[PDB]
Subunit: 258 residues, 3 copies
Amino acid sequence: MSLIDPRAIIDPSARLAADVQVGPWSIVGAEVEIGEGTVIGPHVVLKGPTKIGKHNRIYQFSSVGEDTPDLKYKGEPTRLVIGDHNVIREGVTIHRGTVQDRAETTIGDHNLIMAYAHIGHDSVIGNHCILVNNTALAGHVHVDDWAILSGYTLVHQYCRIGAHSFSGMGSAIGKDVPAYVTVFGNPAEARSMNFEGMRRRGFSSEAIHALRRAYKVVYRQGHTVEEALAELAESAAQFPEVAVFRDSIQSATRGITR
Amino acid sequence: MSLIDPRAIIDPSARLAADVQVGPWSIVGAEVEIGEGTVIGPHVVLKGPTKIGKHNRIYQFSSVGEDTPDLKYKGEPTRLVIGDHNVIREGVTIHRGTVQDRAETTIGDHNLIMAYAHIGHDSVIGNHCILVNNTALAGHVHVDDWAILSGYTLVHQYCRIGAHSFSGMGSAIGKDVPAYVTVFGNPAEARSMNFEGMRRRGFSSEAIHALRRAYKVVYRQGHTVEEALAELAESAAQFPEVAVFRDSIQSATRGITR
Amino acid sequence: MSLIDPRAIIDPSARLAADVQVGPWSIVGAEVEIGEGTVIGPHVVLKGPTKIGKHNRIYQFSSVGEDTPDLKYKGEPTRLVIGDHNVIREGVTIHRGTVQDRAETTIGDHNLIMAYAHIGHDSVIGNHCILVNNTALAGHVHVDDWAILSGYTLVHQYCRIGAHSFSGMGSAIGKDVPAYVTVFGNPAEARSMNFEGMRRRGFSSEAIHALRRAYKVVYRQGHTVEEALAELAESAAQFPEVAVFRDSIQSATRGITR
Ligand SMILES: N#Cc1ccc(CN(Cc2nnc(N)o2)C(=O)CSc2ccccc2Cl)cc1
Ligand SMILES: N#Cc1ccc(CN(Cc2nnc(N)o2)C(=O)CSc2ccccc2Cl)cc1
Ligand SMILES: N#Cc1ccc(CN(Cc2nnc(N)o2)C(=O)CSc2ccccc2Cl)cc1
């Protein structure tokens, strides 16, 4: 009983580790590297230059490491890097980067990418993200740790989904989602904060509330961004959690001279 | 060529009726049971424990019987039950139950589940339902007979879709959708009642109108749900058709004392 | 590398040009015609009667020429036509026509149909159209040249998407989209005009401006469509670019006598 199946295809150009298993009718293309204990299901298409890590699980009908259909991509040998302990569910589409950004699509550790979800070119996902069904990242989308993207959440190109943030099902995100913020609908509008996630991450009640006031300052208090950021400065100095929230709003805003 | 294509792999644990046709590069997993005249297309992945009824047609790229990715589910042996005369089109993802509900996903008889649709854990489906393209049922979703869910309809967990009720395309469903009621958009708002469904099911000239008056009480009259069920009480007792509508509202509401 | 892979199933009635590539585990059904230098990836189902033209690229997990699940279609011998120099990405579903319309679904040359998109019965696609991830054309939909349909755009049956027009991501199109208009939302509403589309297609600044003034008449001025098309007449006879726009509006509105 062999790890790699007789009906599967493995390129001698590819590099598979020890307990790497490849299900039947699965293509392991050239320049693909699969780390220790990773399991590849049946009818799975893997294309390189790709670097899949240790103990990931890639389900049937997923197309991982494919050239973007983007008219931007001219054929360049761009990469994709996948961490350890990721779950890439059925029919998930992961495309490699474009020379235009930094030639790389990057997925971290312990992420759960559910059915038909799209991780488009030059996107960067951290650790412990949950990407529910058909969640689509257009390209160059940066998804920080613990972000939850509810079913069919769509993200416009270049956006930044903050740490601990949450997007409601069928969300259309066109601007950066600050850390801990819960956005909902098409077009995504901020509703509140991921207090449940804060609890899960063992956040002190003092820090949870600091984050509740931190939201009210940015949104509810009628302040502008440039003002909210300035107000936040005190609470942000007192709470490393409020400081994550402020830095996410500071990195989203640049602006022009008047 | 014999019904079970030689390019297909069947678990010696599986039990298939003698006239069951299985296409090439398909997988019939352990504990999968398939009733008389059921046709399984090419590239279909069936995982057990699953009971598939009679005269069903399963199209290519479907992953029927697969474990839910939900962290709630820990690999507990739970079931999938599919009725008779169903159409599960291309790439339909049907997942098995979780021990938290009653460990079973249930699909009735004579239903049409279209391309890339999703029936998540414990979702219970009645009969003659049309579940249009990419429709997603998050988990523990109940769908009563005749119901029509337009393309890319998203239903939340624990939700109840009533009998003959229609949901417009792109619909994002949060609360219950009572029987006959047409709901549209993200978030789904009630608009009218499925009068074509009533016409198709030969509803008496009197019932159709009794149901139109019934929606008004609930919606258009500015009553509470408590007062709506009170006004409906008379008509529900006059017609078993309105009673089907009164019960969908009755079961959907409980609330707290005050 | 060989041209047609040993594990592919090529029906004896399918007619392929001498240099067609059919990947492993791909099915080329009866009455499927394949043009000079077309490429069919691994895991692709092609059903006839379908005519695929020259230098096309059909990708994995695609179902091209499958009968529509629609209840109006009763196993008729209806057709599907695909042009030349087209790209049909992973998981795309294209269905044949119904005898009801012209018994034919057609896709012209130079299109980009992105991952998991759907082309329903009797749909007619022009040339140089981009159809981003999971676009869904319910049926009888007409997409004209250079139309850009963003991620997860949903298009109701019998609709017309005009030349150079654009729908934003997660748009639910119910009424016709005139040529050049940028429509957004569920339900989709007209926002402006695809000016970037106009520059790319080398439009004269004199005619870009004429088209700006054109949208203004219809949408931004309080004119009834009757009055809109009347005011447009002058500009349309001066600018062929504006003429297209007048016609796209002309062809949508028929109306009933009053
Ligand atoms: N592990 C987990 C986990 C946690 C939070 C979410 C966010 N969430 C709520 C939810 N919680 N458990 C479940 N199954 O869903 C949704 O996205 C609902 S929409 C949806 C959901 C599932 C499938 C298709 C659709 Cl369309 C989703 C999954
Ligand atoms: N048999 C049937 C039947 C009945 C009602 C519906 C509900 N419906 C309208 C409609 N009626 N006939 C058709 N083809 O569509 C939609 O869902 C449109 S959206 C859509 C539709 C199809 C595919 C992808 C998408 Cl996105 C759909 C099918
Ligand atoms: N060739 C091209 C081309 C041109 C315009 C568009 C329109 N467009 C903006 C954009 N431009 N390049 C990219 N990748 O996106 C979107 O539709 C964003 S949404 C999205 C995007 C990609 C995948 C899934 C989703 Cl959901 C898209 C592609």
